[PDB]
Amino acid sequence: ALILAQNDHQEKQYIKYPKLAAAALMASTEVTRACQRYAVPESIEEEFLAASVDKVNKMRGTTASGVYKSSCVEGNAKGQAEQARVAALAVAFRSAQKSASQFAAERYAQSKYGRDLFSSTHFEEGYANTYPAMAAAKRASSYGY
């Protein structure tokens, strides 16, 4: 949130209030659909490039010993794992019904998102501008998933 704040008042508000900066990231990745839940790979080789970093992203969903952490859990009652399964396919289907102006917006927004927060080098921005769905599958590492 320090590297998406524009003026120094906004980056001062993100420092003093750490719960604000968490939902500031949740502001910017909903007004620009750079989530995994809006990520549509255009082809099968970009679908696999998305899954190359989800398996790194699930590796922080477990601890360093190998026990499953509490950050990644898809059910708390009987049948809630199926209820979360049958709901997430609907919002995956709603991610395929965007307009052509909405698809081309987030395609240039995902590659924008992956190369200012997650590119210290030339190859990390080499993958982002060529495969924008790989840039959509990079979490902040405060989340387990």
Binding site: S43, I44, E45, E47, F48, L49, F123
Partner: protein, 177 residues
């Protein structure tokens, strides 16, 4: 996921038949040599770190143009990204050897590995040589026929699991080509 106990149960579910003792003969034989298979998987995992160094440096010494500029294992980022996927293939065939069925391999590691290596410019002819030396390193560790480090084992034949792990490595080879 479909393991060896669950491969047969979707075959019976294609016709909705109760699975019976004519079909457990493949399964009760499979559970009888399960101590051999756990003696087989452990021989791979306990030598798993150098086995990808045994293979990828075997790939470089056979073909020295990969470390040449213009090769796809040239820079130090790329050799790290080849040794990273040297061990993912060995991790995912130890997942298929322990489960007794290659339907953890064909969907969690190779469902789309063909077009991934095509669109990245990864050479297909040298990734066959990266995985075939690990094919010859599996069957030396299953059959305890390693010429530099032999492991202590109980006596008996183990030629079926060497044929099974070699039948997992060619499915890696026939899909990425």
């Amino acid at each position: 996921m479909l393991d060896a106990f669950s491969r047969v149960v979707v075959n019976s579910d294609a016709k909705a038949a109760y699975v019976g003792g004519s079909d457990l003969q493949a399964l009760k034989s499979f559970i009888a040599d399960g101590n051999k298979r756990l003696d087989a998987v452990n021989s791979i995992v306990s030598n798993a770190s150098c086995m990808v160094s045994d293979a990828v440096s075997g790939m470089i010494c056979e073909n020295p143009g990969l470390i040449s500029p213009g090769g796809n294992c040239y820079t130090n980022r790329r050799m790290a990204a080849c040794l990273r996927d040297g061990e993912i293939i060995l991790r995912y065939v130890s997942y298929a050897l322990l489960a007794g069925d290659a339907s953890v391999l064909e969907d969690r590691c190779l469902n789309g590995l063909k077009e991934t290596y095509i669109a990245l410019g990864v050479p297909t002819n040298s990734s066959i040589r990266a995985v075939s030396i690990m094919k010859a390193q599996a069957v030396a560790f299953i059959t305890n026929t390693a010429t530099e480090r032999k492991m202590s084992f109980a006596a008996g034949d183990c030629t079926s699991l060497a044929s099974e792990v070699a039948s997992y490595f060619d499915r890696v080879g026939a899909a990425i080509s």
